[PDB]
Amino acid sequence: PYYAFAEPFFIHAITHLHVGSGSSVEEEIALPFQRDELGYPTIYASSLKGAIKSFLLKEFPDKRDVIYKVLGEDENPEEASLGTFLDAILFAIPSRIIEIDSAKPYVWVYVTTYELLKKVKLYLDSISQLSNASFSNLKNKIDTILAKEGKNITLDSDLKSAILNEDFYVELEALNNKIPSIINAGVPLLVLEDSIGREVINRSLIRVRRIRIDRDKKVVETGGLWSEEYVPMKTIFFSVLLGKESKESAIFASCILRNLRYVILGGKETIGKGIVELRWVKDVI
Amino acid sequence: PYYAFAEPFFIHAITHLHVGSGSSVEEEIALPFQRDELGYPTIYASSLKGAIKSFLLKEFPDKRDVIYKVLGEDENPEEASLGTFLDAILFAIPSRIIEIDSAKPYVWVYVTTYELLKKVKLYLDSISQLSNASFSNLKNKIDTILAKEGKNITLDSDLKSAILNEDFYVELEALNNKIPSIINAGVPLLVLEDSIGREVINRSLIRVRRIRIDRDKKVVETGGLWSEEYVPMKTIFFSVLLGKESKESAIFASCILRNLRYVILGGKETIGKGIVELRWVKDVI
Amino acid sequence: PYYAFAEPFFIHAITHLHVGSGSSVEEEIALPFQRDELGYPTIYASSLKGAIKSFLLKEFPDKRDVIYKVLGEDENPEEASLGTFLDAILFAIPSRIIEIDSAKPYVWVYVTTYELLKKVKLYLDSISQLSNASFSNLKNKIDTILAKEGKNITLDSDLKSAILNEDFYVELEALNNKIPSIINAGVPLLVLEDSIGREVINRSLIRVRRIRIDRDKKVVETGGLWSEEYVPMKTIFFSVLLGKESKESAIFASCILRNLRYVILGGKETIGKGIVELRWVKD
Amino acid sequence: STQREYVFIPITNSITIDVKITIGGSDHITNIDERGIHNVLVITGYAVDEKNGRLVPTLDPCDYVKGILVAGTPQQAQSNDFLTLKLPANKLYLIRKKGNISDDLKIYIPYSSPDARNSMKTKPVSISDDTIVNNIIKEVFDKIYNITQKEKVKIEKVKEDIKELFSYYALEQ
Amino acid sequence: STQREYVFIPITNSITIDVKITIGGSDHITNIDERGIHNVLVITGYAVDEKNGRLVPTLDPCDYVKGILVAGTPQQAQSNDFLTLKLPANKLYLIRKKGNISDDLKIYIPYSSPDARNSMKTKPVSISDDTIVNNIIKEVFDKIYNITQKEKVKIEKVKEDIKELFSYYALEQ
Amino acid sequence: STQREYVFIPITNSITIDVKITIGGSDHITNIDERGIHNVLVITGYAVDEKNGRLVPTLDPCDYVKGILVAGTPQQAQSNDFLTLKLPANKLYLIRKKGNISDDLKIYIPYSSPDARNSMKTKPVSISDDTIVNNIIKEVFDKIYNITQKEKVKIEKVKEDIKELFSYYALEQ
Amino acid sequence: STQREYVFIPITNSITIDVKITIGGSDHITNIDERGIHNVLVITGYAVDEKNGRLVPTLDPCDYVKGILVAGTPQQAQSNDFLTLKLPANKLYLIRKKGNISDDLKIYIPYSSPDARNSMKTKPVSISDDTIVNNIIKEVFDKIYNITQKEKVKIEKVKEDIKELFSYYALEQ
Amino acid sequence: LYEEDYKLALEAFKKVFNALTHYGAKQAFRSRARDLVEEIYNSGFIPTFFYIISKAELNSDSLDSLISLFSSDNAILRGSDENVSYSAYLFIILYYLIKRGIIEQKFLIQALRCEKTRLDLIDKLYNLAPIISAKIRTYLLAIKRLSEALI
């Protein structure tokens, strides 16, 4: 196998999360979110790797060599890194719901689309060949959902209709009499047609005006006003951590990745953004 | 037959890929993608060959002599390689779409231009003579598409109007609504005129600001900031693998080239760039 | 007799080409192309003949004696070859065009200078009214074009202005009203002033860096970095094959040269850098 | 177990009488699904011997024979003249891999012996003479896939793909 | 005259008593010429039945058996379990060629019928465990090539070369 | 159904009486597409008599006969002297190619037994004196060309290309 | 044959006599080559013991001991309290590799049974207190590598790499 | 073709390094240098120009605290945040535009003097945007590399 270990994980936003794209002047917002190729939020694996590596380097100040061997040196790289992060795909975004046709009161709900699922399936198909690992449970869950393309569906309920993010009516169907869903949060997961899902997911992001106040006259500074975009808390991204055969790769996959639960992604880490929970697919599915 | 076997294949990007340009050209991007003679992104077959060979020397550790024969010895060469790689032509790039009057909308579509199709037809016609391999299907389909040269067309689907990559309104003609998929995917193929196609394709590329951060003080290290160009997921390149009669070429064309499905191209693979899938044309037509 | 008949042909690049010359220039490239006297990319006749002879020996192994007679013999080379190739001279190179005008969309264009066309006319005048094959129309076209030397001329177009290779503004002007195209690829030709034309051309060439990676730790080996220079795809060269009267020269021209579209020129063929389509000026 | 049998497609006079059970049940590896044929099997290292057309085992990787994989049996009594074997159905060398493969399969192959009297000089020959194409669509492609003329007025597709795909190396001896 | 026979090289013992003509003539195509084992033969689509080591025809081009060609004839207590084949000697798949060869040939390869009541899953086997390398040198490379242990001084080199040159696929069934 | 009777193109005035049916099939290979003539068949190793002009040949390959290839069935009392033969339509020396051909044709060639008296001496016949080419347009460039004088207004184009391109060989006897 | 014993490097004192001699193996695997130490072994899933410290086998992959591998054998017919094992040397967790090794080794590990009385809770320990690193120089590094002070003048170049190259998990109990 | 642009930068620039002092909107200029360039060709010239003039303080202060550069000396351009440190950049681009005859002074000087002709000044820049973008490229990369090295 090309890779020794292949660890898919879910990234769960504890607080809100902000990984910046860097600003342009065709922008509409001063600090936008890293975007997919098809226009969904994403976490570039450069951000993932840098954040997680910074975390590990001070959380495990004794496995330093194992981290530098799997996640690459910092001072004088005389060798590639055996570890590989894939780009975090948006798996599901929390969405407000006003559920007609249900006495089961949900305030929010998880929303995903078929395109995001296709992307997760591509990740799983590729890393299935390039490694000894297999994810037949996850792969078959994803496949049985994807078989239902063309119609909006719900997984952990029987809503039959809803109003998402205050504007978008949907008419759902039930998946094969309660197909057990990937995540476990007692809240339904809806899989929308990507046309609708695009707008729903756009309405699910958080835009926030911030300002800057002069330090001695309690009035706004000139230019100190801007907007800013977050991905909500309770948002789920799907990534994979791939490693190439080595001694240090085994110590990494067996000692370090078993003590990684909470890490700090993104920026704005003083507004309390970017606390996040990594949940490994192997021990949660 | 100058060539014993002719293996045209597609290169479906699985993640975003980054094959870097070698050039003293001062560009805007610090690390641009490789460009063909029309400024479109391409993969120099130097890079194809190096990567595919480095992969094969590991996937098949027993057949290293067959590989060293078809792709050349490494450190002390006595002979010319028997296999040739053609440069990878861009064939289709994904672009976000907004449609006006559909039945079930799309959110992204495949974009190709007529110049790329002409380069592909050049490859096919050139290789139909240096081999016994007559690709009637590809050639006739691409000829029917090239008949409509100079008019944006949707190959199969019925769109008639679109907004590609959030900026470019385009009118569209059905080819005839009577032509199969060039590749059996679920997304329509837009063959654009070349002037608008250039802009659309440049919009589909992914420029990415990246930084380096002082581990001590979580602030950008001086100098640690650069931009970096990627090609999106689901991008399709086109290339051909060609070999001469060797009896190491019959093996290569029958054992090695039937177990290549996923390879890592380009660089930036520690951050997930490069995973790609090969789709041998003889199969996918 | 003694070069009775001749065959001029176009060398159309199907892939990039790299006919190498060692490190034979003072540029920053380490593996440059074969250069003309004017620093333009050329294909020596030695290379062209050697490649074509090798290809023909492979793909016509029964005609080995005819091919030996026309192009030479390995041993017993005491029998002069009755066929010869001239140096292939750059006739037109594709260039990226950002056009401002004409309402017609173009993204690449063919580009020449007047030095190139001068050498092409030199090759062409030295054949027609001397040999007997008659294709005077091409020579008349090249003379009509050479009339306007000293100003960026567009050919078969309505452009009037363009950015060439993302870096050069040029102001064009049609020739008289209209003229048959010298190439048959339906793309405009531009003949440029010999000074801006060569900047455009030397920006149309592909100059890549290349790397040898340490096979285990996936890094570049020390000093495993160099540069190469490819003539771009769709480039056109021009050469002539001159035949001395003989019988097996007729066999050459009949059985062989009438089934030569594609051959492999130059080197770096595993990169795919040699495929070429030969178009004879006989259609 | 699933029991398939390999028939091959030379222009020669051998395909006429090979098999009895075209399907029997509902089993077939090679399929024809509006994209032409699928899961064509290639057997490298062998060559067709038109004189009693079968696969003569040479040791030439450059030699190969292509053909159809169908569920059946040799004449209900033969395989005293065939080479039979059962593989995990992934060790195969299939062309246009589209559909299903049951992860285990046993194949009967028309087979002959080397019989070292002549040098086994093999020469490539591809399908031409499209009336041979016609009566081979008649011979095997009617009976084995009786969807023939039933899902395609585009017969021409599965007509041209034969000349496109079914190459082989005969012995010409 | 030109009548060779191929002897597989596993890390099991179906090794010595397979032939009794060591040379018969004075030549061997696979000739140890004091600069490596040259003209080794590679057969594709075949694996060794390690129990009673013999080549079994699979249909996997990824399955190959490597061994040497020697001048001889098999043992004359045998010869219904060998593929007596006559080849134009370019059809061979030789590796590490040193000279050119007889330009026509007659080869006897140790055969074994597929045993089609089972699935033929195959595994690659290298050659290590030098306790096999020793009695490889002895049981074949001294008998067939008396030149060894008699003239050579880099017996260690040809040891390393069979260790890094002879690999094969075994049925393991 | 279609078959083409090669009709030589000399400046010599014997093309007057050699054809009865003008159309034959529905396809015409030798084209007049406002850029020149097309697919004019050249005949190597042949010549033409200057008395009773037909393709009485040499065998020397430096001698060639240009001529039109167009469908015809001459007189039903000849073609036993206008040589009947069948071609795979890929062995044809065709200058000014612009299409793909049926890979199958029937060619009838004016040709008879050369002589038994004199040795055949050769000379290349060229064209001049535009009135000759005008007579060429008169003779069969309407008799069988049902296209001339209606759309191809570039009559001078055909004039010049015929008068300058068509060189052939003859005996001058 | 060659044998090495995994002599560890703690900050405590159990490393005076962990050997018989500096003799017995092929050579010292762990080298000291004027850049610092090279080829340090790292035993995972083991913890140094409070007193008479040896390798207690926990099952925690986050526990490790870093030690030097030297050519020798332990304490005159001991090793009822050692782990002895032959290893292909591609299974050795070696940090700071510089050269290459025997590709086969006999390794002695000072080892105890876990003593399942107290909860094996271990603590990460680092080599500090230069009055300990000088002790480790004199008592073991000087002896086993007299190359110290008989090759160089810079022993501080390894007094630092002792700080940065040997951390370990002690049982703390 | 472009070999005096490197000479033009010295007496066009004239100061965007030293008298841009306080290192905030002095060093920030490099963001102009890199980003705008990638902005000017990925997104176009006119979007970047609209952005630049947005940050302009075009009253007379950021209309003469720059047209004074045509004539006299180094202009310490403190002012405020990058609006005078931004109108020097408008000056840079227009200086290239005047010294290379893409637009003349008699129009430019007249275009920035009525607020009736600013609009068609920009409307004319819009038509010259392809040519302008092509031509300034090296002249801009010049000061971008100047910034990398010196600024």
Coordinates of C-alpha atoms in Angstrom, one line a residue, chain H residues 9 30 33-35 38 44 55 57-58 63 65 81 88 91 96 101 106-108 124 131 141:
Chain H
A9 CA 10.9 54.0 -11.9
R30 CA 4.7 46.2 -0.3
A33 CA 3.4 45.8 -4.6
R34 CA 2.6 42.1 -4.5
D35 CA -1.2 41.9 -4.1
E38 CA -1.8 39.5 -8.7
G44 CA -8.2 42.9 -14.2
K55 CA -8.9 54.8 -1.2
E57 CA -8.8 61.4 -0.9
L58 CA -9.4 63.4 -4.0
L63 CA -5.1 66.1 -5.9
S65 CA -0.1 66.8 -2.7
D81 CA -3.8 56.1 6.6
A88 CA 1.1 58.5 -4.4
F91 CA 0.4 59.1 -9.0
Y96 CA 3.8 55.8 -16.1
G101 CA 2.2 58.7 -24.0
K106 CA -2.9 68.2 -21.0
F107 CA -5.8 65.8 -20.6
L108 CA -4.7 64.2 -17.3
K124 CA -10.9 56.3 -21.1
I131 CA -2.9 47.9 -23.3
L141 CA 7.1 44.2 -11.1

